[PDB]
Design an enzyme around this catalytic site. Structure first.
Site, short mmCIF file in Angstrom:
data_model
loop_
_atom_site.label_atom_id
_atom_site.label_comp_id
_atom_site.label_asym_id
_atom_site.label_seq_id
_atom_site.Cartn_x
_atom_site.Cartn_y
_atom_site.Cartn_z
N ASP A 121 10.15 -11.10 0.80
CA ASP A 121 9.34 -11.32 -0.39
C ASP A 121 8.16 -10.36 -0.40
O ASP A 121 7.71 -9.88 0.64
CB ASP A 121 8.85 -12.76 -0.46
N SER A 443 -9.49 -6.85 -41.16
CA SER A 443 -8.28 -6.72 -40.36
C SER A 443 -7.12 -7.35 -41.12
O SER A 443 -7.25 -7.81 -42.25
CB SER A 443 -8.45 -7.38 -38.99
N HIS A 493 0.47 -29.34 -55.74
CA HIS A 493 1.50 -30.18 -56.34
C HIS A 493 2.26 -29.45 -57.44
O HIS A 493 2.74 -30.06 -58.39
CB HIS A 493 0.88 -31.47 -56.89
N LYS A 507 8.28 -14.14 -34.79
CA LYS A 507 8.17 -12.70 -35.05
C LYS A 507 8.88 -12.27 -36.33
O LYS A 507 9.56 -11.24 -36.36
CB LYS A 507 8.69 -11.89 -33.85
N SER A 602 17.08 -2.62 -29.22
CA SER A 602 16.38 -1.34 -29.27
C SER A 602 17.20 -0.29 -30.02
O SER A 602 17.68 0.70 -29.47
CB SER A 602 16.05 -0.86 -27.85
N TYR A 690 28.90 -12.37 -34.84
CA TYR A 690 28.59 -12.39 -33.41
C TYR A 690 27.99 -13.72 -32.97
O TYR A 690 28.13 -14.09 -31.81
CB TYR A 690 27.62 -11.26 -33.06
#
Lengths: 913, 363, 358
Positions: A121, A443, A493, A507, A602, A690
DNA sequence: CGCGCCGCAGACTGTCTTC
DNA sequence: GAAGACAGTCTGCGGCGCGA
């Protein structure tokens, strides 16, 4: 040969019985609700001899290969398993290098742990970089300690040269090392950061944790919280949380292991670690002892749970990942961070520009008529040679009547009187060492910035406060949906949700920037640019911490091979280097590896500052990333799993025909060729297919469909209901998952609830948490996902074993997998790239043949038997012909495309010329 | 599209009335007005501050208008090469070294054999071979940032990489004019080819001390233009559809705006305000703020049009002095970027303007 | 004789290989000027523009091309100003007494083969009503005279004379008494409507201007001063056992200089960087004299700083790290004391204001 | 999967300062 | 005594990464 594809099967000569009932069943299933009759353009038959098969059949052959590969490491693990060990020493040494202790703690300056088994370790000072900070190892004999040398004054040398900890002799046998995540300790080795192959293989006891007695993360959250949704709550007592203390608690009932109270390594400095040196070393030795004990409890259990030698041989592989890089890595890091900062300040400037333009509105009282930006306070506070006639002394005659209120009062909230309240708040307070003009405290996170540069359709209930969050953003008190706006905002409303009922926060809202009815104001010039700027900088804002400081070691001139030297692109001041991904094998509950930075999608897409990360992962000069993306690995695996379970034929179910008959170009491919045609959109229906296959449910598919585009709940439910028609039509028993079928989820569920044998190809168990014998999971998605995931992992193990065998019997250089997301790159040196492409093709053929053999049927189609194109490139990109964004282009860098290859075996002899 | 009427009214352009895009970009224009000269001087001062004085081992250099080795100079690099020996001699033989220059260069332009002048800024950087690439990257980087600032929309500014005919990499900076992308700067990294061409007699004297051992220096030439940069700034500053609010404003940056402050006098008719305005004028010039003597002009009867013209010349602040200035002094102040009415005491206004300019320069 | 060598050594002038004699410097054949000389020329031009252009209310600058467009290196800027006056009359709203001035490079011939040399000159063409046109020129005769005392150590050196000719009834010429000899550094000529007729073939309507609500032809007074020659004369007048040039602080290329010595290297470097950044942000020119590993002698460094037109010398030592006090030496006073680091900016601002404020 | 620091954003706020 | 400033104070909603 030419039956329905296939080829002259060199393996398994003889037999090849078709089966009259089997073929009739396959044909009648394919004809009904399918297209069995197709043009079926034949492929040029490949006339080559496979390497000799040592075993009687493929299974025995690969068993012998994996046994030859794994026998030394298996016997080393067993040798350390039953070795007798003394307790920890009373005190540790203070010299550099390695030390052994042993008899009565007698320190001896050992230079190398010259034994074939260690835990080793490591702990590092996070504040003081990624350099090692001492280490405790337990070789089977007499304990071991290592000194980082960073505890001595001076010697602040960067670039990671001789900084990692030596663990291998000069070889003037093989080695095994264990650890919780020994991928984290694969760095800090200084011999694993070598371009040439490493004879040592590593075992993570967290990899075994997820292999035996593991938890799904959806189950790990329940485990740590409790440490239809109501479970049997027994599986918590048989699995741990992938932590060394927790796994030590699970696998042995001893005194609990204690975390460091101060956490000097995580939050601390070098000197403070010197102060607590002995205690920190004691805790590190406690961690090493816990690791050794759990490894002893695990290795026999793991072997009885994963006994097929190929799976363990391939798990020893994939802990030898190696991403070569050069100075271009540092150049890209600096360029991406600089572009991030430049675009951040550009977007800030754009925000101030639209703030100024908005403030200009009230000169003609044009802000009130503005359909947006009207909800602010927006209020104004009522607060010959003759000299001159009287010179500037009149200035001194003016002075003031003492209305200045001293100097403190005018500055923070009263500065710039008469401006709108929002401008005044945004302006830096005049009482500041660093004053900046305009609304420079503006910002993205504020309530003013979304009003301008993120106008879109001016979300009618996006008045914030209370629930706040995104509201309608589309059509179908007053002004529930009106172009003029000027909403009353008396209460939320309005006709519609008028709040964040769904509340999705992961994200998101970046993919909606590209079209998606989410845009800025076309009237302004810097408005849409700011939205574009945010779109480009988002991913780098997400991943700059991970992508930067990756523990990159730059190999010196000596450590590089003679293949780099005496080369056209040799020498040069560019720092060659490498990145071991620190990839934790079996990171998921499935044996899929995990690495948050390198083993990710990526896409290297344009309009993203941080992209091209996988790109410019450059093979050294004289080396090429000869690699292949397995042509629809998961889809083929599910297809063949359905094919053998039903009629033993590859064309039995429409899934099998669609997988290999379809083609990306002008074909009925499953992804972006048929999913788009039967579904909606493109490149997202591929993700939907997938997901629905490979482990998911109808609610997950529906939620992902809403994530893709805007659709109502009833419309989404109707789309899913129509989707189940002609699909598997799952959760229908007494059929012999029944219904229209065309996709065999029966195999995954059937093998899921099949007690300890769990994988067809290599016979590997899942875990003691989700297994059926003890408990029954309320939602079975985890196990059906695991079947395909671990089948893909066994596929990768088979490729790794086959490629190692081919690289050993045939002198193929490089030998370094860069396996990422079902793709494999091997870095196979020059004047072997075509030989290595043939090796990759033969390895794919043998792996698919083994899949077929162990999973029920003997024949293999030629449409899948070989890679469509074995990419032979010098950098890791999704295609040989690709470009990036932040630079001018890759051609500005040294990348020059490559050769996809495929059917271009000009070097027909797999053996060297 | 055709915003040159604004330059016709306010002398930011030459004397010629007909100014096509080719006429301006060719560099054969008759000249510039006072505003253009002030703007170009501001550009040169900003470049000198950003490159030379702030970064060590960079010193300005001069080049003659003719090269005896009598023709007008085409490039500023030759003058830097001639003075390289002395400039490296005065420093302690530090191979990383910089030289800077700004000057007018005449070039031949063929249009259907004229000579056109253009203001070129030259930066010549001598570096070791190992640090050549990283220093070149730093140079083009912060030059690009310099271009982005002083620009309302710095997306139109861009850079490109390219390969020279001799196999040397380089970079070219561009601005995206509405008619098309036009070059502004170029970067060329050379292995002291021109330096040895000028001085091939001996090579030992040309070496620099990078450490214990000496290596042949590598040169980098960054050559940019400013008159075209001036037109680019003027075009960028001007801004069209769907706004429902059209006002001709030229949002030149406060750092390089030609006129910073404007002075004026109200209707009165109390008179005597001219002396106060003159004193304020002097107080403004003695600190370095350019003032528009706007109080001489009269018989307008409309402040809105006066403010409009002052905006068209990009005057950051307009100061109006009324009868309420002699007692309870409160001059009216109007900001270019935001048409906001303010009342400010005569004192602390000069320091406010100085702080505004300094803070804009900082960020 | 040694003044030119001292200027070249201290980067005040360029190489003397091509302009060793003072004739080349006086004319346009000089081989350039050093960075200190360039800074001094720029400062002098800026001060002249501020006193003449920015100070004046009706005066606005102009720009003339270095080459003659024609209808050949340019010889004067009066033609461009006269051409632009047609538009400036309407743009300035009948600025009858206004003018246009510019400081720029003009080419002059020097003479086997006669060369062309470029020299920096300041040319101002002013339109004035005829009824007091010459009087308006007389006004310049005062204002330009004020410039003679703006920075000159000895105002008596400057002199004025009156000259007349057929083209100009009244003209003024200014001369500077250089150590080598008296040299004409400023000239004035008051041309009438003949120039307007030559440039404008019968353009009486455009030539006539609005003055006092009256149509009057504007007489053009052209005043040309030698910016480079004037700067050289002022520098020579500044000089007077110790060779130190007491240059004007306003036109001095460098106001203060930063040095390192007798203290920590890192602390001294940080202090020097902070001082340089503060000077740059505040608009105060700071000489980058730090980062020197030679350390020849304090006297040599002081002489080099004084010769470089440095208003004051700042030395940072252990006293700066102890109590914030560093050595401050004034070249004019020939005295040294201790000054605070924070108060250095205030002292520099006060000195600059005092120098600028007459 | 998801969850607790974490980190700003926005509003509150009891008390100091000025006229 | 009445109103503005201010440096803390609490809540919220993105987000990250964990655990040798």
């Amino acid at each position: 040969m030419l039956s329905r594809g296939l080829h002259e099967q060199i393996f398994g000569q003889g037999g090849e019985m078709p089966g009259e009932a089997a073929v009739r069943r396959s044909v009648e299933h394919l004809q009904k609700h399918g297209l069995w009759g197709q043009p079926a353009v034949p492929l040029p038959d490949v006339e080559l001899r496979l390497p000799p098969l040592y075993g009687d059949n493929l299974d025995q052959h690969f068993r012998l290969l994996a046994q030859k590969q794994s026998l030394p490491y298996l016997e080393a693990a067993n040798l350390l398993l039953q070795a007798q060990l003394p307790p920890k020493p009373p005190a540790w040494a203070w010299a550099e290098g390695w030390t052994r202790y042993g008899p009565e703690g007698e320190a001896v300056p050992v230079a190398i742990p010259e034994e074939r088994a260690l835990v080793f370790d490591v702990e590092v000072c996070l504040a003081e970089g990624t350099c090692p900070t001492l280490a405790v190892a337990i070789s089977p004999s007499a304990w071991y300690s290592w000194c980082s040398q960073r505890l001595v004054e001076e010697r602040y040398s960067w670039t990671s040269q001789l900084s990692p900890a030596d663990l291998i002799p000069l070889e003037v046998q093989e080695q095994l090392v264990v650890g919780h995540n020994v991928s984290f300790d694969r760095a800090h080795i200084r011999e694993q950061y070598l371009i040439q192959g490493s004879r040592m293989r590593f075992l993570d006891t967290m990899s075994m944790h997820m292999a035996i007695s593991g938890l799904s993360s959806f189950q790990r959250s329940l485990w740590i919280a409790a440490k239809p949704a109501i479970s049997s709550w027994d599986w918590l007592d048989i699995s741990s949380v992938n932590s060394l203390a927790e796994v030590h608690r699970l696998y042995v009932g001893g005194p609990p292991l204690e975390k460091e109270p101060r956490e000097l390594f995580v939050k601390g400095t070098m000197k403070d670690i010197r102060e607590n040196f002995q205690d920190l070393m004691q805790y590190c030795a406690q961690d090493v002892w816990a690791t050794h004990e759990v490894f002893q409890q695990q290795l026999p259990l793991f072997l009885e749970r994963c006994p097929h030698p190929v799976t363990l041989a391939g798990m020893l592989e994939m802990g030898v990942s190696y991403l070569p890089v050069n100075q271009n890595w540092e150049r890209y890091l600096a360029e991406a961070q600089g572009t991030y900062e430049e675009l951040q300040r550009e977007m800030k400037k754009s925000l101030m520009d639209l703030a100024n333009d908005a403030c200009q509105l009230l000169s003609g009282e044009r802000y009130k008529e503005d359909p947006w930006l009207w909800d602010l306070e927006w209020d104004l506070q009522e607060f010959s040679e003759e000299e001159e006639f009287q010179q500037d002394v009149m200035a001194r005659a003016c002075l003031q009547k003492l209305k200045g209120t001293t100097e403190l009062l005018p500055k923070r909230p009263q500065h710039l009187p008469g401006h709108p309240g929002w401008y005044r708040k945004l302006c830096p307070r005049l009482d500041d060492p660093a004053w900046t003009p305009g609304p420079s405290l503006l910002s993205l996170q504020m309530r003013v910035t979304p009003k301008l540069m993120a106008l879109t359709w001016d979300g009618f209930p996006l008045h914030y406060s209370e629930r706040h969050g995104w509201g309608y953003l589309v059509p179908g008190p007053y002004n529930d949906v009106d172009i003029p706006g000027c909403w009353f905002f008396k209460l939320p409303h309005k006709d519609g949700n008028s709040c964040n009922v769904g509340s999705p926060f992961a994200k998101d809202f970046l993919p909606k920037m590209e079209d998606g009815t989410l845009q800025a104001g076309p009237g302004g010039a810097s408005g849409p640019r700011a939205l574009e700027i945010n779109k480009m900088i988002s991913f780098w804002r997400n991943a700059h911490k991970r992508i930067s400081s990756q523990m990159v070691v730059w190999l010196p001139r000596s450590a590089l091979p003679r293949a780099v030297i005496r080369h056209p692109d040799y020498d040069e001041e560019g720092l060659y280097g490498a990145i071991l991904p620190q990839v934790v094998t079996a990171g998921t509950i499935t044996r899929r590896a995990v690495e948050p930075t390198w083993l990710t999608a990526s896409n290297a897409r344009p309009d993203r500052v941080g992209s091209e990360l996988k790109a410019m992962v450059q093979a050294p000069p004289g080396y090429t990333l000869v690699g292949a993306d397995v042509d629809s690995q998961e889809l083929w695996i599910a297809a063949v799993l359905g094919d053998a379970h039903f009629a033993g034929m590859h064309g039995c179910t429409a899934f099998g025909w669609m997988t290999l008959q379809g083609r990306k170009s002008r074909g009925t491919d499953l992804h972006s060729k048929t999913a788009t045609t039967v579904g909606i959109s493109r490149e997202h229906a591929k993700i939907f297919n997938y997901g629905r296959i490979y482990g998911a449910g109808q609610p997950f598919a529906e939620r992902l469909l809403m994530q893709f585009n805007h659709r109502l709940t009833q419309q989404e439910a109707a789309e899913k209901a129509q989707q189940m028609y002609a699909a598997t039509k799952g959760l229908r028993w007494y059929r012999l998952k029944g219904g229209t079928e065309s996709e065999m989820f029966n195999k995954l569920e059937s093998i899921a609830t099949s007690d300890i044998p769990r994988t067809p190809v290599l016979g590997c168990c899942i875990s003691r948490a989700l297994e059926p014998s003890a408990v029954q999971e309320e939602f079975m998605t985890s196990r059906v996902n695991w079947v395909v995931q671990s089948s893909a992992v066994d596929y990768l193990h088979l490729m790794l074993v086959a490629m190692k065998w081919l690289f050993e019997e045939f002198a193929i250089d490089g030998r370094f997998c860069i396996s990422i997301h079902d793709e494999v790159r091997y870095l196979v040196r020059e004047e072997d790239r075509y030989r290595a492409a043939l090796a990759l093709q033969i390895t794919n053929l043998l792996t698919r043949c083994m899949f077929a053999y162990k999973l029920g049927l003997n024949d293999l189609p030629q449409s899948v038997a070989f890679f469509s194109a074995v990419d032979i490139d010098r950098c890791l990109r999704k295609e040989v012909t690709m470009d990036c964004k932040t630079p001018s282009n890759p051609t500005g860098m040294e990348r020059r495309y490559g050769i996809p290859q495929g059917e271009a075996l000009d070097i027909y002899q797999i053996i060297e010329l | 599209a055709l915003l040159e009427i604004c330059q016709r009214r306010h002398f930011l352009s030459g004397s010629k009335q007909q100014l096509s895009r080719d006429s301006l970009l060719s560099g054969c224009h008759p000249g510039f007005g006072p505003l253009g000269v002030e703007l170009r001087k501001n550009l040169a001062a900003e470049w000198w501050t950003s490159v030379v004085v702030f970064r060590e081992q960079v010193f300005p250099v001069d080049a003659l208008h003719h090269k005896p080795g009598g023709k007008l100079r085409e490039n500023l690099l030759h003058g830097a090469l001639e003075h390289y020996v002395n400039c490296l001699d005065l420093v302690n033989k530090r191979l990383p070294y910089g030289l800077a220059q700004i000057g007018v260069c005449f070039h031949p332009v063929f249009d259907t054999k004229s000579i056109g002048e253009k203001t070129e800024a030259s930066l010549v950087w001598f570096t070791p071979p190992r640090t050549s690439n990283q220093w070149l990257d730093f140079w083009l980087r912060h030059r690009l940032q310099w271009w982005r600032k002083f620009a309302m929309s710095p997306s139109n500014f861009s850079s490109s990489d390219c390969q020279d005919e001799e196999g040397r990499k380089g970079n070219k900076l561009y601005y995206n004019f509405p008619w098309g992308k036009e070059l502004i700067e170029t970067l060329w990294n050379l292995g002291d080819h021109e330096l040895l061409h000028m001085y091939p007699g001996n090579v030992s004297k040309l070496h620099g001390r990078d450490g214990r051992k000496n290596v042949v220096p590598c040169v980098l030439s960054v050559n940019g233009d400013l008159d075209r940069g001036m037109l680019a700034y003027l075009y960028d500053s001007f801004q069209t559809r769907k706004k429902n609010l059209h006002r001709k404003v030229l949002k030149l940056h406060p750092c390089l705006a030609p006129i910073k402050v404007a002075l004026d006098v109200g209707r009165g008719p109390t008179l005597e305000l001219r002396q106060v305005c003159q004193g304020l004028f002097n107080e403004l010039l003695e600190n370095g703020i350019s003032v528009w003597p706007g109080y001489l002009e009269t018989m307008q009867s409309s402040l809105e049009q006066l403010y409009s013209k002052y905006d068209e010349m990009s005057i950051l602040f307009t100061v109006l002095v009324t009868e309420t200035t002699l007692e309870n002094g409160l001059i009216h102040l109007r900001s270019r970027d935001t048409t906001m009415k303010e009342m400010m005491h005569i004192s602390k206004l000069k320091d406010f303007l100085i702080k505004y300019i300094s803070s804009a320069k900082n960020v």
